[PDB]
Ligand binder design. Structure first.
Ligand SMILES: *[C@@H]1O[C@H](CO)[C@@H](O[C@H]2O[C@H](CO)[C@@H](O[C@@H]3O[C@H](CO)[C@@H](O[C@H]4O[C@H](CO)[C@@H](O[C@H]5O[C@H](CO)[C@@H](O)[C@H](O)[C@@H]5O)[C@H](O[C@@H]5O[C@H](CO)[C@@H](O)[C@H](O)[C@@H]5O)[C@@H]4O)[C@H](O)[C@@H]3O)[C@H](O)[C@H]2NC(C)=O)[C@H](O)[C@H]1NC(C)=O
Ligand SMILES: *[C@@H]1O[C@H](CO)[C@@H](O[C@H]2O[C@H](CO)[C@@H](O[C@H]3O[C@H](CO)[C@@H](O)[C@H](O)[C@@H]3O)[C@H](O)[C@H]2NC(C)=O)[C@H](O)[C@H]1NC(C)=O
Ligand SMILES: *[C@@H]1O[C@H](CO)[C@@H](O[C@H]2O[C@H](CO)[C@@H](O)[C@H](O)[C@H]2NC(C)=O)[C@H](O)[C@H]1NC(C)=O
Ligand SMILES: [Zn+2]
Ligand SMILES: [Zn+2]
Ligand SMILES: [Zn+2]
Lengths: 5, 335
């Protein structure tokens, strides 16, 4: 998550 | 509790941020990170409040919930009755540039040539170009299209970084910040100017600001715009004066982003900061100018007249526009 989606 | 923490990317932006902090009486303070993606993370964690981003990075930040706050606005002719801060944004022209002497090189013969990009994931330097090439090629092997390139942010051992040069000492080769000699709009154009690459993917404005005496920089002093040509999508070549009829796409202006829960407060402070250090600002030549950094585009693009309010309180998808958003999505399907 840090490319969250 | 009312101060804003700006995030600087790299040593040079940090130094300029420190100066702005000093003159602002610490109303603005600084956090620094090695890359733009790391600055986004600091913002998400709440350790930094904001930073100005290119459209491609706005897409990344957007999916993580950050929002557009104010946009860069450069000097324009068509909507001149309105003040800059309230004036709609025009967007900039993404172009492909080559040297006149490299005759015969056109959009249709870029295969196996050398390329210069601002940085991986950016609008004019990567997303637009590579998206067009992937489509036209029916292949996700964009890393095998050019023979060698300098594309900050890619694997340092790959051909996408083969042409990057690092800093004064050869360190930080291909890092996506200003320590890399060929990073950003200015760096990618320099990469072409010194003939390290055959084509540079930048924006219309970069060509003008670095030719015919506009830069004084050692490598740019003797550059004339007639020695350059733009590559048009219809296989043709044109003078840099015809950008409106020979560009790859029009790009959304760079904009300041922040966590939605901090947007209103960041907006307020920034508006006061530019009344002081902006173009016609109270302190500009005298003490400090937010929008200058000797052609290095540190924190903000040097051709910025002011930061403008958005109007329509746009989401990140609305700000970037559906044309551009679908373009990125499609290209990402590859990576
Ligand atoms: C590709 O990208 C290019 C760069 O981004 C861009 O090139 C052009 O972009 C704009 C828009 O087309 C050009 O247009 C001019 O806009 C000026 C404002 O930016 C405006 O000019 C100045 O005129 C004078 C002096 O030139 C000064 O103005 C007056 O009024 C004040 C009172 O308010 C009074 O005090 C003065 O007596 C003047 O009467 C003023 O400032 C000056 O600063 C200049 C800095 O060097 C200096 O040259 C000049 O001497 C003045 O001292 C005004 O700013 C004009 O009316 C123009 O219409 C840019 O000039 C041009 N940039 C370049 C590098 O060529 C392209 O448009 C873009 N192409 C595409 C397709 O997108
Ligand atoms: C690479 O090739 C892609 C596939 O054609 C391009 O993408 C798309 O093409 C268009 C342009 O935005 C999109 O089409 C429309 O969206 C809706 C419904 O389709 C219409 O209402 C609207 O008028 C457009 O006709 C496609 O949705 C999109 N295809 C896919 C699968 O998403 C893409 O533009 C191109 N890349 C570059 C850089 O040119
Ligand atoms: C630091 O920011 C503060 C807050 O805006 C500025 O000081 C004041 O400015 C306004 C104009 O008079 C007042 O309405 C505020 O109430 C007042 N706030 C405080 C806490 O005193 C100041 O201009 C800023 N300094 C700089 C250089 O940016
Ligand atoms: Zn950009
Ligand atoms: Zn010849
Ligand atoms: Zn809306």
């Amino acid at each position: 998550l840090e490319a969250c989606a | 509790y009312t101060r804003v923490v700006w995030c600087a990317v790299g040593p040079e932006e940090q130094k300029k941020c420190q100066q702005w902090s000093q003159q602002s009486g610490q109303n603005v303070t600084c956090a620094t990170a090695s890359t733009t993606d790391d600055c986004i993370v600091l913002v998400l964690k709440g350790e930094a409040d904001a930073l100005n981003l290119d459209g491609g990075y706005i897409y990344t930040a957007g999916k993580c919930g950050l929002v557009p706050v104010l946009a860069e606005n450069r000097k324009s002719s068509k909507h001149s009755s309105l003040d800059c801060v309230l004036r709609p944004t025009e967007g900039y022209l993404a172009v492909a540039v080559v040297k006149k002497a490299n005759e015969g090189l056109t959009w249709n013969s870029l295969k196996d040539k050398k390329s210069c990009h601002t940085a991986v994931d950016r609008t004019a330097g990567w997303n637009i170009p590579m998206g067009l090439i992937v489509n036209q090629t029916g292949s996700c092997a964009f890393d095998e299209f050019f023979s060698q390139s300098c594309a900050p942010g890619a694997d340092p051992k790959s051909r996408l970084c083969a042409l990057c040069a690092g800093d004064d000492q050869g360190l930080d080769k291909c890092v996506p910040n200003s320590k890399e000699k060929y990073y950003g709009y200015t760096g990618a154009f320099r990469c072409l100017a010194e003939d390290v690459g055959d084509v540079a993917f930048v924006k219309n404005d970069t060509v003008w600001e670095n030719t015919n005496g506009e830069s004084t920089a050692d490598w740019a002093k003797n550059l004339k715009r007639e020695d350059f040509r733009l590559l048009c999508l219809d296989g043709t070549r044109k003078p840099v004066t015809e950008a409106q009829s020979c560009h790859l796409a029009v790009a959304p202006n760079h904009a300041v982003v922040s966590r939605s829960d901090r947007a209103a407060h960041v907006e307020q402070v920034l508006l006061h900061q530019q009344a002081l250090f902006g173009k016609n600002g109270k302190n500009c030549p005298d003490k400090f100018c937010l929008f200058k950094s000797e052609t290095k585009n540190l924190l903000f693009n040097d051709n910025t007249e002011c930061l403008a309010k958005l109007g329509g309180r746009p989401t990140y998808e609305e700000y970037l526009g559906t044309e551009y958003v679908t373009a990125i999505a499609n290209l990402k399907k590859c990576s």
